[PDB]
Amino acid sequence: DTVVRVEHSPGDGERGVAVEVRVQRLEYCDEAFLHKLLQLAGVRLHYEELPAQEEPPEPPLQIGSCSGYMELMVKLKQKLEVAGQLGSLHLLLTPRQLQQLQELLSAVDSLLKMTLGGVTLTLLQLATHFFTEFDATKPCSHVRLTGTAVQLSWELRTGRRTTSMEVHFGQLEVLECLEYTEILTFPGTRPCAHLRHTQILRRVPKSACHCHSELALDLANFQADVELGALDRLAALLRLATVPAEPEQQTVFRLSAPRATLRLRFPIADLRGQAVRAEQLRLELSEPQFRSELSSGPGPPVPTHLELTCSDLHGIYEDPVPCLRVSKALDPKSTGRKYFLPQVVVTVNPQSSSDPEEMRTFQSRTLALSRCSLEVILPSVHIFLPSKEVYESIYNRINNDLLMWEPADLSTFSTLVTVLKGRITALVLDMEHGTLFSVSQYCGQPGLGYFCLEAEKATLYHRAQLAPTIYPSGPHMLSTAVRIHLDPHKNVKEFLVTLRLHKATLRHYMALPEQSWHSQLLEFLDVLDDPVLGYLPPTVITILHTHLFSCSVDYRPLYLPVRVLITAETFTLSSNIIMDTSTFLLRFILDDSALYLSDKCEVETLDLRRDYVCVLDVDLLELVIKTWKKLSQPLFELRCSNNVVHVHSCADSCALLVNLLQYVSTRVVLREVSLVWHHVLMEIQLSKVSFQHEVYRPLSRQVFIVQELEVRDRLASSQINKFLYSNMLTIKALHVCCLRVSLMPLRLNVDQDALFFLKDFFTSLVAGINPVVPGREFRFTSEVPIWLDTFAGLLIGLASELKLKRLCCRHGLLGVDKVLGYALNEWLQD
C-alpha cells in the first residue's frame, strides 16, 4: 500500500520561500542504521512568499516535482550521513540575497551525504523544474551547476554552520541574462575537476549571507574553459543580480595548477565577429590562474584584484599564430634561489571613488586612480612564435584593439610593462630593462595622458646578416616620454615628443644606399592606425622637441670612408614649429662639437689614437632654419645663421682631409667662415662672410660680401699680421662674372718667416692631396693702393711699392686664365 503519511509541516517559512517539506507525486512506501525506504520526490521551493503577500495571484515558476527518490534514507538520529537518490533542488529565485538568507535562517553537527547524479541547478540571478528532474536523475539564462557524476561530500560541519563540500566533478556555467557569449567551463574527471567549498552562507566563516566562501578550487588537469565571451559580463552578474538580455562575504577564489586549458577574451559590453579587443586571444594550456576576489554588493568599497602567474606558459595570443608564444622566463634575481615568472595583474577601483622619477611617479599616480586596468611583469618573455610579426601583426591588433574595449568599471585607467630582456622577432631588439606605458583621461579630463618608454640598449645592430655592433662607447636610452594634451573639441592629433637618445648611435644605413635604414623606415613607420570605435582617425600633426644628447656618429658607412669620427655633444632638433607643413623652424642649438679623422683614406685605418687630432671643431652652430617648402618668400630658405667655425690643422692633416672629401633658394648664412689657427701654426680669420648664395645679382649673386677677409698669418708665424687676398671685401661679389676689392690702407705685408712657406705647404698638399687638377665683363679689380711691405721673391726682397690693377672690363681671366689676366702689361712702383 502506498502509505501517504507526509505533508507540509512546521518550519521557518522564509520571507521569499515557504518551508513546506512536501512529498508529492510519490508513493511513500515505508516498509542506529534505521532505514525507512521512501520517496521524498516532489519537495518544491515554490517560494515567492514575500512578494505581493505570497504573490497568490502569480505563484513563482520555479517549482520542483519528483525531485529525487532518495529512497535509501541511510542512517538515523544519533554524522547523519545519507546515501541518496536525490541530489538537490535549485532556488531559481535570487541566489545572492533571498536564497542565501533562507539557507542561513534554516541552518541557524557534522552530517555527511552522498548523492547520485548532480542535479542541473538553474538559480537565475521551469528551469528549476529541470533541476528537480535532474535531482530525480541525481542560449542564455542557462546557469547550470550539473556535475554529471556527483561526488559531492556535504561535510556540513554545523559547528554558525562552518560547512564544507569536496567534489570530484565540475559544473558547466553558461552564466547569462535573467551567441555563445558566456563562459563554457567543462571541468570533469578527482583532481581533474576538484570543486571545493562551493557555498557557506554561515555567520561563522564571515561576520550577502556572510559567506566568506573560500572556493579555492585546486585542480591540476585540463578542465577546459573552452569559450569565455567576457570578463565584465561577470562583474555585473556578481555585484548586481543580472542586467543582461538576448543581445559581508569576501569571495576569495584561488586556483593553482600546472595545466588547465583556458581561453581569455576581453570584455566589450554595450552596458559598460566579436569584441574588438584582442581578437582570438587564447591563454591555451597555460597555468590554471584566473583567480579572482569579488563581493556581493555593487560598487565594491574594497578594491577587486585579479592575479595570474605562469612559468613558461604556451599561451597562443591573438591567434596568425601568437605574437608571444611562451613566458620563457629564466631570470634569477635575488641572492637566494629565485625563478622569475610572468603575471597579468588587475586592480579595479569603484567608480567615482572618494625619466626615472617623473615617468614612474606620474603613472603611479595614474594607477592610484582606476576605472579599468592592465598590468604585466614579464622578466624575460621576449617571445614570439616562429609565425609572428612585430612589425605588422602587433600593430594591427595590440595597438588598434587596445583601449577601445568599453573601458569603464565600478575611463581613467593605467597600464604597465616591465622586461629585463626583449626580442623583437620578425630586428635589433637590444632590449634590457624596458617598459611601456599608457594612460587615459588624466585627472578626469579627456585628452590628458602620460605615454612613456624607457630602456638601455646597444645602439645599432643590423639584419639580413650580422649586426652593425655600434655603441662601443643616469639618463636611460630611448626615453621617449612624449606628452599629449589633445582636445576632443578640436578633434586633431597633437604630440609633444620629448625624445631622448642618450649616448646612442642611431644609424641604420648599412649599405652604400640607405638599405637597412630603408628596412627600418619600412618596419617602424606606422602612425597609430586607429580604426577602432569612438576614434575616427584624427588628422596627424607632429611637434617634436627631440634631444639627441651625445649621440656619437663614427660609423656612417659609404663606398670608402676612413673610420670617420664625428663627436657631436648635443643634437638639439628642437623643432618648436610643425614639421609636417610648408614651414619648419628648427633651432639646432648645438654645444661645442668637434671632429677627428683616421689614418688613411682606404677603408682600413689604424693609429695610436682613434680619437685622433682635431680637424674642424665648432664652438656653436645655431642653424635656425625656417624651410618654407625671416619672411624670405624663396623656397627652402636655409638660413644657417652659423655662429663660427674654428679650424686647426697641419699640412698632412688638411691634405688628408681634402683627400677624404674628394674620395668620399636663398642660403643667407652671415656665418663667420674661419677663425682658423691652421705641423704649422698660422692664424687666419674670415669674419662675417655673408655668402648668401642664390639670394637674388639676378642669378646666384653668391656674394662673398666678406665683411673682413684679413689673412691673419701664414708661413711659420702664428701671430696675426695683416695679409689680404667694415672692410666689406667682396672679393667674389658675383652676377651673371664680376669681382671687387676693399681698398684697405695696407694689404700685402709679407715679411714673416718664408712667404714661400705656404708654397711648400701647397707642395705638401699636392703630396697629400695626390690629385691636384687646378695647379658681364669681369672688372676684376684689385682696387687697393697696395702698401706692399718670382712674385714672392720680389715681395721678400722689397720687404706703396705697387698699385691697384683697375682691370675695368679686362676679362683677362677665364677661370684658368686668371694668371693670364694678371700678366697683362707690366707694373712696378717705389
Other Cβ atoms less than 10 A from the Cβ of 512: the count is: 10
CA distance 307 to 309: 7
The amino acid at residue 82 is V
Evaluate whether 329 touches 340 at the Cβ level (below 8 Å): yes
In residues, how long is the chain? 830
DSSP assigned state of 476: P
**Strand pairing class (573-574; 346-348):** unpaired
CA angle 547, 640, 723 (to 5 degrees): 125
CA distance 485 to 487: 7
- The residues, any chain, with a CB within 8 Å of residue 493's CB and separated by 6 or more, are 486, 528, 538, 539, 540, 541
Measured in whole angstroms, the distance separating CA 371 from the mean position of its chain's CA atoms is: 20
CA distance 30 to 361: 75
CA distance 424 to 714: 58
Cell output for 267: 570584455
Element holding 627 (H helix, E strand)? strand 622-628
What resolution in angstrom units was achieved for this structure?
A: 3.2
CA angle 423, 429, 430 (to 5 degrees): 110
**Strand pairing class (573-574; 483-485):** unpaired
Contacts for 25-32: CB closer than 8 Å, 24+ residues apart: 25/65, 25/66, 26/66, 26/69, 27/2, 28/2, 28/3, 28/4, 29/1, 29/2, 29/3, 30/3, 30/5, 32/75, 32/76, 32/77, 32/78
- Residue 97, sorted as left (phi over 0), alpha (psi -120 to 50) or beta, turns out to be alpha
Torsion of CA 271, 272, 275, 280, to 10 degrees: -130
3-state secondary structure 780-811: CCCCCCCECCCHHHHHHHHCCECCCCCCCCCC
- The residues, any chain, with a CB within 8 Å of residue 157's CB and separated by 6 or more, are 109, 110, 163, 164
CA distance 29 to 382: 70
Element holding 646 (H helix, E strand)? strand 646-647
DSSP assigned state of 475: P
DSSP string, 282-343: --TT--S--EEEE-SSSS-SS-EEEE---SS----------SS---------SSS-------
Select from 342, 88, 160, 140 the least CA-distant residue to 245: 140
Torsion of CA 426, 427, 433, 436, to 10 degrees: -60
Evaluate whether 706 touches 686 at the Cβ level (below 8 Å): yes
CA distance 676 to 745: 24
Measured in whole angstroms, the distance separating CA 174 from the mean position of its chain's CA atoms is: 36
Select from 650, 647, 640, 663 the least CA-distant residue to 593: 647
As a whole number of angstroms, the longest Cα–Cα distance in the chain is: 159
**Strand pairing class (616-617; 646-647):** antiparallel
CA 655, 656, 659, 665 dihedral sign is negative
- Residue 507, sorted as left (phi over 0), alpha (psi -120 to 50) or beta, turns out to be beta
CA distance 295 to 277: 26
Select from 143, 123, 37 the least CA-distant residue to 85: 37
Way it was determined: cryo-EM
Start-to-end C-alpha separation, the chain: 159
CA distance 610 to 617: 16
CA distance 264 to 283: 6
CA angle 17, 18, 20 (to 5 degrees): 140
Select from 404, 406, 412 the least CA-distant residue to 447: 412
Measured in whole angstroms, the distance separating CA 679 from the mean position of its chain's CA atoms is: 54
Select from 172, 221, 223, 217 the least CA-distant residue to 194: 217
CA distance 214 to 205: 9
DSSP string, 479-542: ----EEE--TTTTB---BB--B--S-------SSSSHHHHHHHHHS-------STT---PBP--
CA distance 762 to 754: 13
For residues 532-545, one letter each, b for 16 or more C-beta atoms within 10 angstroms of the residue's C-beta and e for the rest, the string is beeeeeeeeeeebb
CA distance 632 to 624: 14
CA distance 35 to 40: 14
CA distance 556 to 564: 7
DSSP assigned state of 233: H
Cell output for 206: 564571515
